[PDB]
Symmetry: D2
Subunit: 256 residues, 4 copies
């Protein structure tokens, strides 16, 4: 099934997760041919500023995510930042996410693989698409069976990311490929929200295995990535659009 990974960027509160989770559950009942996976980070471990929001800790976050899985029967994903975190996170996370800056950290990758969960690696803004073959090879060496690579943009001069859509067919040679619709048009340190939907249309027309998109009931109040979180109320329309474009374009997806 096509994957849709969605949720609020950060675990701002169990309350926020339950509100978002309720809508993701409703959509999962409406779009049965899509596999939904609920995402939220227990820690923003790489904020630019020491004064910015990080979160409420790994214990609180894992608990809140457990509530979402229990209340709604949704699969769960969250990111890890150091190797020791893999095991406790794997108790709740069906997919362990590796942050883009950390895509080359061998121990983090091996720790995630050791848990027996699926692993989704964000492609570093410094990595070339062909450079991801070695990422997959580490994860296979560590025992991983279900592996995703996520396109999230590439450094393009200062304070800008570009999406090179050539990466989608290149990375598909060795893993399932997800397109991150949210952070790919985030300007680090043109934009931004106005480009989210057009580029997710591009990703599906080119061909991918799923889309990653963050959502919040009121984006302007979000504590992380406010400029690019999608309003919750817009998610349904975008998902239906994704599915329609994929239905038509998929006739033309090239083999391997």
């Amino acid at each position: 099934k096509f994957l849709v990974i969605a949720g609020p960027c950060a675990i701002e509160s169990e309350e926020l997760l339950l509100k978002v989770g309720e809508e993701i559950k409703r959509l999962s009942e409406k779009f049965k041919e899509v596999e939904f996976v609920f995402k939220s980070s227990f820690d923003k471990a790489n904020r630019s500023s020491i004064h910015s929001f990080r979160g409420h800790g790994l214990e609180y976050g894992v608990k809140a995510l457990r509530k979402v899985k229990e209340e709604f029967g949704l699969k769960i994903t969250t990111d890890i930042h150091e190797s020791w975190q893999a095991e406790p996170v794997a108790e709740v996370a069906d997919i362990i996410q590796i942050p883009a800056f950390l895509c080359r950290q061998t121990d983090l990758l091996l720790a995630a693989a050791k848990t027996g969960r699926a692993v989704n690696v964000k492609k570093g803004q410094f990595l070339a698409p062909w450079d991801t073959k070695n990422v997959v090879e580490k994860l296979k060496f560590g025992g991983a069976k279900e592996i995703y690579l996520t396109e999230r943009g590439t450094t393009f001069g200062y304070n800008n990311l570009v999406v090179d859509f050539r990466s989608l067919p290149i990375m598909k040679q060795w893993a399932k490929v997800i397109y991150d619709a949210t952070h790919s048009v985030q300007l680090p340190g043109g934009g931004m929200r106005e480009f989210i939907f057009p580029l997710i249309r591009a990703a599906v027309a080119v061909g991918c295995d799923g889309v990653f998109m963050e959502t919040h009931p009121e984006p302007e109040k979000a504590l992380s990535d406010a400029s690019t979180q999608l309003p919750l109320s817009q998610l349904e329309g975008i998902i239906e659009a994704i599915l329609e474009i994929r239905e038509v374009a998929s006739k033309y997806y090239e083999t391997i």
Copy 2:
């Protein structure tokens, strides 16, 4: 809102090549009635990397060859100019005058094209940010152009590589009609890709939304005298045009206003 398809062989290798490709584009134009086809070929490759590479058979020969395509098949014509004096003779045959990407800031060339009364299509320089095309359009409007296109053809991304930033399409749409160049956007300059990425990125362009696509084609690309690595085999053009019409239709209700 007829979608534009600009297509033809990169260079005017011979009048015979032009008529062979023209016959196919004419056949497609009769099938895809919802498309406006414009036939393209360059009478001069004025910017080749090497002094030893094919340039062409001269302006007079090329205009005559293009005129024969227009006469025989009733197709609109486009070709590129390189210095201001070429605008006048070229406008005798060309419905759309093309401005090469490296020359997109050359004021005199832009004005020369604009005062002919023909449509003008400027290739966006590999050095230019999408928001900086606003002034290119202003120059053309100042010079009398009433029908203006901007063509996305990739941006310098380190050495010998171009990337297509698809954010450029909605940005440039604020000021002109936008064409996606499927051929030169995946060329690696000075020596992906390349051919394997042409069709995926065309699909991206139409899903994002554009007003036309530019695609070069040759019966036998391996033998072409210019851009051999990226010209589409002529037999593949029909299938690609059908795909972009299908993808455009399904994506179109989602295209953002303005």
Copy 3:
């Protein structure tokens, strides 16, 4: 001799050329081991805006440059924009300059070469350093004997140029290399003036055959490239600095 190419960006008036030319003459008498070449453009043929200053025409410009050469006995350089301009310009210009955007225009290069003058090609912001070998080959084919390549920065995302100093030793394989201190830190469409002197120190420490630097008595009033023209009064100090650093560093310039 080390080359210093300097002058006001645009021929704003014969008056401006004579004021600048007077100082360049004085410096040429003070620094006898340097070859000075006076630069000014008769046309800014590639301005972003239709409303910006271009100049007073080729005839006026060639005349003003002739006045500088006659009054001060200085060598002259100016840029051309279309092939027909090479011959009339060559009447006064010792070095014909090819603009960066036009570095691949075969006819312009051949027209410049045909005049028998030296030719200095600005390296396009799109060109790789190894890509310049073919530029030199065109000029040799057209009869040119004295050929320069000028480093002027490379496209680095949007509205930014970076100087890759690896280009200096690479381009030296096939031509004399000039470093453009002015336009290399011009942001098209960090910066800017504060970086001019530090990067010209880098260029001389790496090793080049000359430096190109634009100057105006009152930069803030200049009609082109105001943000990067050096105040005339600062030129002497920078030249002396160049020469001192070159004297020491040249011990280490690698062969070929």
Copy 4:
């Protein structure tokens, strides 16, 4: 304003390698009394591209080996850490704790280093703009660091290539002491250059102005187990250090304030 030279073999291939290089750096430190030498070697290459590549002999072995260099030669020591728990044991031997470039935004790693009371040297990420190092320094100051360096090691420039934007040196100097990494700045990541550009770009860095240079060195680079293409032969270190002291001296009166 003693200039810093950080030098040593990329990886702790063996304690024996360390002592061989250490003996030479000690000899140079006695000649170039105006330089503060800091000996560098990594106990772990934690970010290699391939699972098959050399990583090292473990933290305990590496710290012991570094301690032997400090004991035998009286040299200051630096090494890099990869996860927060390493800061404490490493601070037992390291005068300067190095933060790898990909990890320059990892708040916990920065704080772990800062609270040790050791100096901290952060490699600027290949993704980071020079003005965005201000917040990296703020994090370290918040965490108690009193001696902070920022190291220029190149910026992503298309695929598999780094460029050094020397404007970064005066920009970063606003907030920290600045080191130029002569070795990794010309490495082509994931497979110029390379070695032929090391010395020219060091000359550029000192002419622009910096507070130190970082240079890896191995008696026989061809045989090194990491960064073999860019490690300097040990016999060349003396000549390069003399050149940068000469160029620094002649350039120094021109270094801009602040």
